[PDB]
Structure 1
Amino acid sequence: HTIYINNMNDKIKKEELKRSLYALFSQFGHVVDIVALKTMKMRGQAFVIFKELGSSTNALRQLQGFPFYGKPMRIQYAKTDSDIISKMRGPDYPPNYILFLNNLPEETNEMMLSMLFNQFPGFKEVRLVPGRHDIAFVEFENDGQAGAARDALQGFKAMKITYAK
């Protein structure tokens, strides 16, 4: 639900860094809240949390390693649930790290599935090579990479994306 952005410079102020993160995430959509603590435990770490996970996945796909205040900010899915996103919103294995389902139309190939799972930094196995070319199974070694991959591929028509839980 939030795009956690890291590897940023700590020389920027908290309000200026939150405004820069909001201006970077404003291309993907409106931002609900911004978390930017300039303490030594989280120096250089700031993120924007939205009510919808799709805008956060689009922001994590767009502004990963882009030039933001002199440093390449690597943006992925949030490992922790945001206090604003959870309040806007309102199964322990779900969402699992392996998305294995059917109905993968519009020329879904093994190389296309590998290029889609390359956005996930911890992807392990990709199996999309059937006779009907419908069932695809992408398994990742990291939960936060597979969550960002599912948020990026959520809406690629619709197609079925079922976690292996």
Structure 2
Amino acid sequence: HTIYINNMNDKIKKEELKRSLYALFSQFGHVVDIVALKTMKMRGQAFVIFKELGSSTNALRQLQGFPFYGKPMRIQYAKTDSDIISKMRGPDYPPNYILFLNNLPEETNEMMLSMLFNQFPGFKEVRLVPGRHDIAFVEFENDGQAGAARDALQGFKAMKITYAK
């Protein structure tokens, strides 16, 4: 639900950064909250939290490398769940980095899913090619990127992608 952004121009004052972040990311869904600090450790970064998960995936794919205050932002799925999400809401391998399932045909193909899977630096295994063109086996270096790809097309109007749980 939360995306981690880095490579941000740290000269922007904190309250202005957060307000532009809110504005920019509102186009994909309701942003619940934004965590951004200027400490040495955290400067140039921000966590953007969305109510809907599909919104986070769409944001990630569409704004990857978007010029913001002069620099191309780098977006990724956060490592952990945001405190606000955990409070609003209330297995050991999950989150997993291998999503195998089918329900994604229609002249779909391996260079197609390979470029969609390619979008992610995690691009490791891609199995979509028999007469099928409808069974997708995706091994993504890490679950942030597998989760990024999965969260990006998390409802391919409905495809079925099942992590190797």
Q: Which category of TM-score, normalised to the shorter sequence, fits these structures?
A: over 0.9
CA shift for structure 1 position 67: 0.9
Q: CA deviation at 1:14?
A: 1.2
8 Å contact from structure 1 (residues 21, 47) kept in 2 = no
> How high is the TM-score relative to the length of structure 2?
0.94
- Tell me by how many angstroms 1:18 deviates: 0.8
Q: Deviations over 1:43-100 (max 9, x none)?
A: 0101210122111111111111101111111111111211112222222212311111
Aligned length: 165
Contact 1:34 1:48 in 2 (8 A): yes
Taking the aligned partners of 1:82 and 1:18, their CA distance within structure 2 comes to 17
3-state SS, counterpart of residue 73 of structure 2: strand
Deviations 1:112-133 (A, max 9, x none): 1111112211111111012233
CA contact (8 A) 2:14 2:36 kept: yes
Instruction: Describe the superposition over 1:22-51 as per-residue Cα deviations: whole angstroms up to 9, x where unpaired.
Output: 111011111111111111111010121012
Runs of 4 or more, structure 1, over 3 Å off, are: none
Give, in angstroms, the shift of residue 139 of structure 1. Answer: 0.5
Aligned counterpart, 2:111: 111
Q: Alignment RMSD, CA only?
A: 1.2
Could you tell me how far apart the structure 2 residues matched to 1:95 and 1:161 are?
13
1:103 is displaced (CA, Å) by 1.8
- What's the secondary structure of 2:18's corresponding residue? helix
Contact 1:124 1:141 in 2 (8 A): yes
Compute the displacement of 1:154 (Å): 0.2
TM norm structure 1: 0.94
